[PDB]
Amino acid sequence: EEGKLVIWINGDKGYNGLAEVGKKFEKDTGIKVTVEHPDKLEEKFPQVAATGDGPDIIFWAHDRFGGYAQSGLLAEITPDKAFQDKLYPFTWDAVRYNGKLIAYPIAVEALSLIYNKDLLPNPPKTWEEIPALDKELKAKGKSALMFNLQEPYFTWPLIAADGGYAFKYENGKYDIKDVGVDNAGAKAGLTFLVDLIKNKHMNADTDYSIAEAAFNKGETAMTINGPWAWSNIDTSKVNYGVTVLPTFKGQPSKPFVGVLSAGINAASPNKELAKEFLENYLLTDEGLEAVNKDKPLGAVALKSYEEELAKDPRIAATMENAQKGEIMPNIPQMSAFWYAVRTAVINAASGRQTVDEALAAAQTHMRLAVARELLLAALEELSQEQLKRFRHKLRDVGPDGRSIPWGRLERADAVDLAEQLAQFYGPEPALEVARKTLK
Numbered sequence: 001e002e003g004k005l006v007i008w009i010n011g012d013k014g015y016n017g018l019a020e021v022g023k024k025f026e027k028d029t030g031i032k033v034t035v036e037h038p039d040k041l042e043e044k045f046p047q048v049a050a051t052g053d054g055p056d057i058i059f060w061a062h063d064r065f066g067g068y069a070q071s072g073l074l075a076e077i078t079p080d081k082a083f084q085d086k087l088y089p090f091t092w093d094a095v096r097y098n099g100k101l102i103a104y105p106i107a108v109e110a111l112s113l114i115y116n117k118d119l120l121p122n123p124p125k126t127w128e129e130i131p132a133l134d135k136e137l138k139a140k141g142k143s144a145l146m147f148n149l150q151e152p153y154f155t156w157p158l159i160a161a162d163g164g165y166a167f168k169y170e171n172g173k174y175d176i177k178d179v180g181v182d183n184a185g186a187k188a189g190l191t192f193l194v195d196l197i198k199n200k201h202m203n204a205d206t207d208y209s210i211a212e213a214a215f216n217k218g219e220t221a222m223t224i225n226g227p228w229a230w231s232n233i234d235t236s237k238v239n240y241g242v243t244v245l246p247t248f249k250g251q252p253s254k255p256f257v258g259v260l261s262a263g264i265n266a267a268s269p270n271k272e273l274a275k276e277f278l279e280n281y282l283l284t285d286e287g288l289e290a291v292n293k294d295k296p297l298g299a300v301a302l303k304s305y306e307e308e309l310a311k312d313p314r315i316a317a318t319m320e321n322a323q324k325g326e327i328m329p330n331i332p333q334m335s336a337f338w339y340a341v342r343t344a345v346i347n348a349a350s351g352r353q354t355v356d357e358a359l360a361a362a363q364t365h366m367r368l369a370v371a372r373e374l375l376l377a378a379l380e381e382l383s384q385e386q387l388k389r390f391r392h393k394l395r396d397v398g399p400d401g402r403s404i405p406w407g408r409l410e411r412a413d414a415v416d417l418a419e420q421l422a423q424f425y426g427p428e429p430a431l432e433v434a435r436k437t438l439k
Contacts, residue, residue, distance in 0.1 A: 002269045004032050005277060008045065009059040011037035013260075014294030021287045025277050033277065049073045049265050056268040057278070062094040062103065062259040066330025069097035074263040075271055076100045083279055091301040094259035094327045096172050103261035104278050105301040110322040111157055111226050111255035112314075113246065117239045119221040127158060127192060127246045127253075134201040137221055144201065146215065147224035148208040149193075149349060152341040154224060157255040157325065159189035159345075161248035166329055166337045176333045176370050181341060182363035189248060190355045194348050204349040215240075227298045227318060242314035245321055252324040259301070259327070336369040371427035372418070378431055379414035386438075387414070393437045399424055 005022065009015050015035045022033025036055070038044055042064055048054035050073060068074050079101070084092060091105035115123040119142060124133055134144035148154040156164070163185020168178035180186065196202045215223040216236035224245070233240050245253035262282070264274045281287050285305045291297060292309070299319040300306045310316040328334075340362035347353040353361070382390060391410050394417070398404040404424055406412055412420075421430035 003273075005034070005057065005270055005273055006055040007033065007035045007057045007059070008041045008055040009035060009037055010041065011039075012295070013037075013059065014291040014297070017291040017294035018282070020290045021281050022277070024286075025281045028281075029273075029276075031273055046071060046073060049267055052267050054265055054267070056265050056270050056274050057262055058265065059106065059260060059262050062105070062261045063328055063330055065095065065103055065261055065263055066097055066332070068263065069100070069102045069330075070332070073266050074102040075266045075268065076102060077104060077264060077275065079104070079275075079279060083283075086303060087283075087301045088303060088306075088323070090257070090323065090327060091259055093169070093172065094257065094330070095261050095263075097330060099172060103263040104283060105259045105261050106283070107260040107297040108299045108301055108319060108322045109226055109228075109258040109260070110299075110318055110325050111154065111224055111245065111253075112242050112317045112321045113222060113244065114215065114225055114229075114233070115222045115241050115243065116215070116218060116220075117241050119218070123222060123241070123243055124246055125244075127161075127248045130196065130246070131199060131201055133221070142218075143214075143220045145222040145224070146202070146206055146211040146220040148206065148211050149197075149202065149204060150207045150342075150346065152338060152345055153256060154208075155193060155345050156341070157224070157245055157253035158193055158248055159186050160254040160326065161185070161251050162188040163251075164189055165326065166334065167331070169327070169329070174329055174331050174333075176331065179363055179366045179370075181337070181344070181366065182359040186359055187355055190345065190348055190359065192248065193345075194355055197349055204346075227296075227314075230314065242317040244317060244324070253321070255321055255325040256328045257322045257325045260297070333366070333370055333373070336366045340365040368427055371431070372422055375422055375427050375431050375434070376414060376418040378434060379418050382414070390417075390434075390438060397433070397437060 007018065007022070009018060015037050019035040022035060025031065025033050042060050045054055045058050046068060050071065065074060087105060091108060092101065095101055095103035095105050113123060119137070124130060130144050137144050163180065163183055165180035168175040168180065197204050211223050212229065212232065214220045216233055216238055218238060245255065247253065262278050264271055268274060283302055288297065288300055288302055288305045299315050299322060300309060306319060310319065344358035344362040348355045348358040391412060394409060396403050404420060406420070421433060425433050
């Protein structure tokens with residue numbers, strides 16, 4: 001373990017180029033660096049890192065690093081402001097969890113507008129032009145745009161364009177009490193999407209497979225997709241371009257941003273060697289180039305090498321849409337976001353719910369789920385004697401002069417108390433009831 005670096009990276013990345021970086025790192029310092037790509041390493045890491053047996057460095061999308069950092073499995077990195085300013089500022093937000101930097105950002109991915117140059121040499125700059133564009137291409141048997149409408153990941157760029165957001169991100173922190181899925185911007189975006197469906201410009205049943213097949217066979221002029229899809233379009237011999245997403249009401253589309261990141265194992269005995277390898281060997285032009293020409297990293301976080309990589313207009317498009325988009329939040333509450341919004345968009349796209357009631361319902365679910373988590377957290381942090389006095393002060397408590405029924409109140413733990421109080425008072429007023437009970 002000591003005096004040696006073990007790096008875990010997914011097998012679909014340029015791990016041989018990373019090994020070349022480790023080889024230059026060895027001949028400069030004498031420290032051996034071995035790169036491995038275990039199967040389902042993102043699931044093996046949380047069990048072998050706390051156990052004491054895993055890698056020193058793990059490369060993965062920043063979304064899973066939030067769960068890792070919640071378990072204390074990632075060490076807090078210490079790059080000075082000089083090294084931080086060498087990377088794009090927004091990429092640093094993707095590797096922050098409860099204020100602490102937990103990883104180095106490596107590469108950046110985001111949705112972009114993919115268009116067929118033979119069908120559409122000049123793609124539209126606004127969503128507003130799409131209806132008139134579709135009516136023209138429909139005369140030739142084509143359609144303007146097809147993309148996956150079944151997953152909020154793909155429809156959120158339009159919904160967030162005019163002001164929708166999952167949780168407010170300010171001062172390097174997410175405010176889980178500021179949910180923006182039912183504000184006026186999200187309504188305007190979803191209304192425009194539904195209007196496209198009603199006016200037959202889109203079909204509510206289009207999924208990822210149908211959209212990809214239709215674009216790669218020249219049937220539609222545009223699709224919305226990421227770099228993972230480029231290889232299939234390369235096979236299809238479609239003459240395609242990758243460009244900035246259309247604006248809506250003058251505001252850019254805001255796709256979710258994924259940041260491939262390098263985290264240092266908290267149980268590693270080579271944190272200093274890892275930091276030296278990542279800052280001075282990997283995150284340089286030479287190291288990124290060695291990795292990228294093995295398998296392309298896409299848009300990278302290192303400014304100097306991203307200018308060189310942006311000579312490919314497709315990578316420039318990815319980075320541009322990334323800078324205009326929003327970092328994918330790495331907090332656990334996003335589980336309520338994905339469930340709620342996926343239902344709302346599908347129901348609104350079908351006409352089972354209006355846009356207003358679909359977004360309202362999604363807003364309530366996320367809000368009530370957060371409130372129940374906050375009620376439990378407030379009750380679980382009480383000491384055993386605080387909990388004891390809380391239990392006894394809880395007797396005779398109940399709405400309408402009827403005390404809440406408990407099986408054995410004097411031994412009801414936090415989970416029982418929180419769930420039962422939430423059912424009788426709502427999750428938010430149960431918290432004020434819990435506080436007033438003590439005082």
